[PDB]
Structure 1
Amino acid sequence: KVFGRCELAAAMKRHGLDNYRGYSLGNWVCAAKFESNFNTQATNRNTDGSTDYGILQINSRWWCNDGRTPGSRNLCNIPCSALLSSDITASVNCAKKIVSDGNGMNAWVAWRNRCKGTDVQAWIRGCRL
């Protein structure tokens, strides 16, 4: 599923991401934009052989099991394929764990490079939330 910008903000709100660990909804929308372009099916291989999965590009190196990332952890206790569902619950639950782990949203390289410090409110501008 390819979300619309306000559709995704509403889904993230509904699953309690809005202001989670102090990050406004627009941070999370912006991160999704630049990670996945709002596409729940997005997958990208990393140079280290890990893969990033879903709307938030959660990495098999630490967070989900894909059975092909040697030496990796599965700290969200889920198959990476659960992170590609049209329903964002699993991605949200896992993102909550990631963002709680000490480095906040900087874990998302696209957030750090393209969202951090910008007018992230623009991302939920005009949305009926």
Structure 2
Amino acid sequence: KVFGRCELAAAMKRHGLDNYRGYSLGNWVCAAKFESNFNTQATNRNTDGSTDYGILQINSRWWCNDGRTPGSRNLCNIPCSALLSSDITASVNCAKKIVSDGNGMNAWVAWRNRCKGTDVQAWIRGCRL
């Protein structure tokens, strides 16, 4: 599923991400924009052989099991494929656990490089929430 901007903002708000750990909704939408272009089916391979999955590009090195990342953790305890569903629930729950592990949203490179310190509220302007 390729979300519309406001559509994803609303699905995200409903799943408890607005102001989660102090990160306003614009942050999550901005990160999703640049991690996945709002596409739940996005996958990207990393140099170390781990893979990033879904709307928020969650890494199999630590967070999900994909059966092809030797020595990795499965800290969200899910198959990585569940992160590709059109239902963003699993991606959201895993993201909450990530954002809470000490480093906040800096875990997302694209957030760090393209969202942090910008006007993220712009990402939810116009939306009915």
C-alpha distance in 2, partners of 1:10/1:111? 19
Identity value in percent: 100
Distance in 1, matches of 2:80 and 2:65, equals 5
Where does the alignment leave 5 or more consecutive residues of structure 2 unmatched? Answer: none
Structure 1 position 47, deviation (Å): 0.6
**How big is the shift at 1:3?**
0.1
Q: For residue 5 of structure 1, report the CA deviation from its aligned partner.
A: 0.3
Q: CA deviation at 1:41?
A: 0.2
Cα deviation digits, residues 76-109 of structure 1 (max 9, x gap): 0000000000000000000000000000000000
Corresponding position of 1:58: 58
| 1:7 to partner: Cα distance | 0.1
Cα deviation for residue 6 of structure 1 reads 0.2
The alignment's TM-score, normalised by the length of structure 1, stands at: 1.00
Equivalent residues, number: 129
Structure 1 match to 2:19? 19
**So what's the TM-score if we normalise by structure 2?**
1.00
Q: Please report how far the alpha carbon of residue 14 of structure 1 lies from its aligned counterpart in structure 2 after TM superposition.
A: 0.4
**Cα-Cα RMSD:** 0.3
Structure 2 match to 1:3: 3
- Please list every run of 5 or more consecutive structure 1 residues that lacks an aligned counterpart in the other structure: none
Q: 2: distance between equivalents of 1:12 and 1:74?
A: 23
CA distance in 2: counterparts of 1:69 and 1:110, whole angstroms: 23
Find the residue that maps to 1:52 and give its secondary structure: strand
